[PDB]
Amino acid sequence: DLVDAEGNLVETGGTYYLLPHIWAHGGGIETAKTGNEPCPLTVVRSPNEVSKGEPIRISSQFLSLFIPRGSLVALGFANPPSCAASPWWTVVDSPQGPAVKLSQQKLPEKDILVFKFEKVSHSNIHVYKLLYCQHDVKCDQYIGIHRDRNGNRRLVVTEENPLELVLLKA
């Protein structure tokens, strides 16, 4: 089962902060308004090292209390921007590649259950990598960062330098 910063089991009945292994890379996971977006529909990493970011909500494909190792999950926000229809993140096509976004129309359970945590072989500090999965399901792709012209650290599918996280219960 998944585990938070304090070695406790992660619970879908709670909210957490998705922080970095190293507190030099940045802060928590936020929202930002990029491109021609009428509001903050882009899921980004805060440039501020202190910043805990937005409180995140997790849900297991098994609709249970804990998340079993390798089980698919939906990652969404506790408090989304009014303009979004649902609090869940989804992954759409972008010039930069598969990007993590929020949507202006409701999303089926089948298109938010596209995340899977993968523990990092580092020990006694509970860390994880975030994988994206599609249909053909297949989670061979990792989520990293793409800094745009305006400084936004967008979450997208990168080839290398993938995200590494620890879940801090709020």
Could you please describe the fold and organization of this structure?
Keywords: Disulfide bond, Protease inhibitor, Serine protease inhibitor, Signal. Inhibits alpha-chymotrypsin at the molar ratio of 1:2 in state of 1:1. It comes from Psophocarpus tetragonolobus (Winged bean). The structure is a monomer. The chain is mainly beta and 170 residues long. It has one domain (1-170): Trefoil (Acidic Fibroblast Growth Factor, subunit A) (Trefoil), CATH 2.80.10.50. The protein has no helices and twelve strands. The protein has strands at residues 15-20, 29-32, 42-45, 56-60, 73-77, 86-92, 99-103, 115-119, 128-134, 138-147, 153-157, 165-169. A six-stranded antiparallel sheet has the order 2-3-11-10-9-8, with no helix packed on it. The protein has a four-stranded antiparallel sheet with strand order 5-4-1-12, with no helix packed on it. A two-stranded antiparallel ribbon has the order 6-7. A hairpin with a 6-residue loop joins strand 6 and strand 7.
Question: How is the secondary structure organized here?
Answer:
Blueprint: E1 15-20, E2 29-32, E3 42-45, E4 56-60, E5 73-77, E6 86-92, E7 99-103, E8 115-119, E9 128-134, E10 138-147, E11 153-157, E12 165-169
Antiparallel strand pairs: 1-4, 1-12, 2-3, 3-11, 4-5, 6-7, 8-9, 9-10, 10-11
